[PDB]
From a paper:
[name] is a ~ 140-kDa, seven-domain, membrane-bound metallopeptidase (MP). Differential scanning fluorimetry, small-angle X-ray scattering, AI-based structural predictions, mass spectrometry, and high-resolution crystallography and cryo-electron microscopy of multidomain fragments of [name] revealed a novel 313-residue catalytic domain (CD) from the igalysin family within the metzincin MP clan. The CD is flanked by an N-terminal globular C-type lectin-like domain and a wrapping domain (WD), followed by four all-β domains.
Recombinant production and biophysical assessment of [name], [name] and [name] — To investigate the interplay between [name] and [name], we cloned a panel of seven peptidase constructs, which included the wild-type CD and the inactive E540A-variant, in which the glutamate acting as general base/acid for catalysis in most MPs (hereafter “catalytic glutamate”) was replaced with alanine. Two search models derived from the prediction in Section 3.1 were used, corresponding to domains CD + WD (N331–N807) and Oβ (R808–[name]), respectively. In addition, a formate anion, which is a metabolite of the E. coli expression host potentially taken up by [name] during heterologous overexpression, was tentatively assigned attached to the catalytic zinc. The CD is asymmetrically divided into a larger upper subdomain (USD; [name]–L546) and a smaller lower subdomain (LSD; G547–V634) by a horizontal, deep active-site cleft that traverses the entire domain and extends from the non-primed to the primed side in the standard orientation of MPs. Consequently, the WD sandwich functions as a scaffold, positioning the two flaps as clamps that reach around and thus stabilize the CD.
Author numbering: 330 to 876, 901
Write the structure that this text describes.
Amino acid sequence: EQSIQLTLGPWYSNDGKYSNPTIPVYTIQKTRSDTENMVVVVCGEGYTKSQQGKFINDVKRLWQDAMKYEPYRSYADRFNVYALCTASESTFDNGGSTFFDVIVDKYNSPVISNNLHGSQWKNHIFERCIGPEFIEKIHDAHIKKKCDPNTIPSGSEYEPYYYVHDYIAQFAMVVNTKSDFGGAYNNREYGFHYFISPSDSYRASKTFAHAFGHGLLGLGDEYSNGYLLDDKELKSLNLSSVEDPEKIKWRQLLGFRNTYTCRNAYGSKMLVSSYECIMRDTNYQFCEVCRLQGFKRMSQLVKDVDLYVATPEVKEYTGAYSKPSDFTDLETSSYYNYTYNRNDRLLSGNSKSRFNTNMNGKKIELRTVIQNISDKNARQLKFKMWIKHSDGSVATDSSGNPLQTVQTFDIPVWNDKANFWPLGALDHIKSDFNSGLKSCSLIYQIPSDAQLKSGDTVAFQVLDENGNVLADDNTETQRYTTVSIQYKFEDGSEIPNTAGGTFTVPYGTKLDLTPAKTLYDYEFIKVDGLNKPIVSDGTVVTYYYKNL
Ligand SMILES: [Zn+2]
Ligand SMILES: [Zn+2]
């Protein structure tokens, strides 16, 4: 009941096998209008018509798994996700005719092969054919197509299609295979903004999250080689060749969690902020620099986000890794020595129980990084830190004074926001990493006469100007809860061409999103499940739309 139709001439289907395809559209997630959310369009490669149920379930699995990683998780309910059921004549492994002519080259890179059947512009199909039709028929903006992609253009072959990657934040192509491969194609000046990953490889979800890190978050491969020249140094979001810690772009993050600049290989001139990142090796999480940069990138596409508050940490303050000269050795072994030293001093998250009665007279530091997303309003955050007894009470010194401290930090405006992948940008040239960025450190001396008890821990809060708690000592290990979204007609029927997925949120989160006025041509009636704390797995939020 919901589909788009394409007209593919010889440049896109030279053998005529997909000259006029009908493509069913499935909505996996639609929590707001497409103008308010980041739109993700996923197509299938090497799935025959009878395998489209497998494709939709594969897209839901890979998507739900990608949304478990920060920074994507912080925006999980701000994406609209659509699965386009592109049918191939053959499965990918059987090797016959497929919708996207994907081949795996000698370097294990998956590519759309224009020369497989002579379709000269096959790898331009997303922005010249699928994108404009989807943006006209399905996307809430309903932008009319203005170009015929099968006729010879009189001017630029690229400029008429630049709008496609502003309405569609990302194109993803999932290949029906167990083969292990991954490929990201980002070059907006030449219309490319898609990636190719497999449905069933041993690391399928990890590959998907990594490739999405290039496409959506604008991040580079952290296994990259070479010395970055000035233009490449300024352009890169998460790589650097600056050996001086006083000048490196991410100097404010040094010593925050596992952030210690190091070479990405022996003798390498390419430096990374952490050796343990998914952008270098798919077995890891996103590093703090990738989390910050990716959060900043997505804030440009969903503009109701005001602040980034990295999860604070508490460590015993010994003086180690407290000044730039402590970060001059860039060997990978120096990164690992740094992480062992941090483990030995950690007093937060899973190491909260490492606080003991021998902490009297010792200093402790509450540290985090904050990014202001506003280019207009400066912010003031208040940090509170105290020593709390196992029975909730606040520990005191030998005179009855509580072992508590407070500090206020100013967060400057993000003045350079227009240079950081704003909506409509074709590239990234230069940006000031420190614009709107503030590393916050509260160093408190535990009194020599502190009355410490067995089971005491460090408690803390980060508060906004109105006293709202943005983060606390329970944040790092807080439970996440699974939410399921369902789409129904007024009579209770599941809306055809919907395949409602799940995402996770911090326990107690109140979802406050304005539902889209329409789902396909159905008008919104009501929603059950919003503006109420999510405190159970399998919590269902049901969106009701009126049938035609
Ligand atoms: Zn990569
Ligand atoms: Zn990283």
